[PDB]
Design a protein around this ligand. Structure first.
Ligand SMILES: Nc1ncnc2c1ncn2[C@@H]1O[C@H](CSCC[C@H](N)C(=O)O)[C@@H](O)[C@H]1O
Length: 328
């Protein structure tokens, strides 16, 4: 589906709007160095310029949405990035040899600083065939993105991989098909190696059958893992129409569906999908803003932009969550 692939252009507009204002990179929570903080800004800026070369339509939707970004949505992107990063970095410090499988990766460039910071970290980007062909073109075209991953300018990878360079792999795969998913994972991951499965904004666009079989198969595949899943919820409180308005606004404007939004309308119901795992934590993004983000970080974001409506940030961010299912 071309419309589901175009949701990544909204996710890239958020990431480039946060970096352009200053929200990211947060060098403390993401644990970036002085050089890698400069590289985080320079890799994302070079991804936007290279996206212009390969697409006028995709650059037009990313550029217009980025510059029309409000302070409230920049707070939602900050908590979204440093929340998933805090869960990744805790697992990568305790476990030296780790392999990551970013399901529904899109235009995510967190693997660039992560591979640098951890010498024994493998990584595996996975998206639709059309999406990963655009990401392969952008990484191989830009000179600075070429140096980060050790890529050539030409398409030199073979068979199931568009990129196959040492400790990073890019691959095409429909995740709604479980036969295609397990065939790819057999040739790019191992059972015994500790794992971090990232499903950032992926499982919301899938039906309940395709998403539940993806959770049960991947957890049963590895002996030791950690599933950091970010997604929206419809809201549990009565007269809370956040979920019914979101399904009606996506269907009318863009012809997009979030099938299991109302089904998993709370953070408890969302976390019950990973009930097979023994240790399951779950907190909405407003709870992560008040408990996980330090006082030094909140003062820094206040210096960037005027967040006039803090209650409007609470209403939005309570309808997003960060789940962490660990098993062994
Ligand atoms: N069945 C499927 N197979 C492969 N990719 C899928 C998929 N369903 C949704 N996606 C991908 O999930 C992404 C959702 S937008 C999220 C982009 C990225 N994870 C980020 O957080 O910045 C899109 O890029 C889309 O292509």
């Amino acid at each position: 589906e071309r419309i589901i692939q175009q949701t990544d252009y909204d996710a890239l507009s958020c990431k480039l709007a946060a970096i352009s204002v200053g929200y990211l990179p947060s060098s403390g929570l993401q644990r970036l160095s002085v050089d890698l903080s400069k590289k985080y800004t320079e890799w994302h800026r070079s991804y936007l310029i290279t996206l212009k070369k390969f697409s006028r339509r995709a650059f037009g939707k990313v550029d217009k949405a980025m510059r029309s970004s409000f302070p409230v949505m920049n707070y939602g992107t900050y908590l979204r990035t440093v929340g998933i990063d805090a869960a990744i970095l805790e697992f990568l410090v305790a476990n030296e040899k780790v392999q990551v499988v970013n399901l529904g990766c899109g235009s995510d460039l967190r693997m660039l600083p992560l591979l640098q910071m951890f010498p024994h970290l493998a990584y595996v980007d996975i998206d639709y065939n059309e999406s990963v062909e655009l990401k392969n073109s952008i990484l191989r075209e830009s000179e600075i993105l070429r140096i980060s991953l050790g890529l050539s300018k030409e398409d030199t990878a073979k068979s199931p991989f568009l990129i196959d360079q040492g400790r990073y792999k890019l691959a095409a795969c429909d995740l709604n098909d479980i036969t295609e998913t397990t065939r790819l994972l057999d040739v790019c991951t191992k059972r015994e190696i500790p794992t971090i499965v990232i499903s950032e904004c992926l499982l919301c666009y899938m039906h309940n059958n395709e998403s539940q079989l993806l959770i049960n198969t991947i957890m049963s595949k590895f002996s030791h893992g950690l599933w950091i899943s970010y997604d929206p919820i419809g809201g549990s409180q009565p007269n809370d129409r956040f979920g019914a308005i979101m399904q009606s606004n996506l269907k009318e404007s863009r012809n997009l569906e979030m099938p299991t939004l109302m089904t998993y309308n709370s953070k408890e119901k969302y976390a019950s999908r990973w009930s097979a795992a023994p240790n399951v934590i779950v907190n909405d993004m407003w709870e992560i803003f008040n408990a996980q983000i330090p006082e030094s970080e909140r003062k820094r974001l206040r210096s960037l932009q005027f967040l006039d409506e803090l209650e409007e940030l609470k209403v939005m961010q309570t309808h997003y969550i960060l789940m962490k299912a660990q098993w062994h």
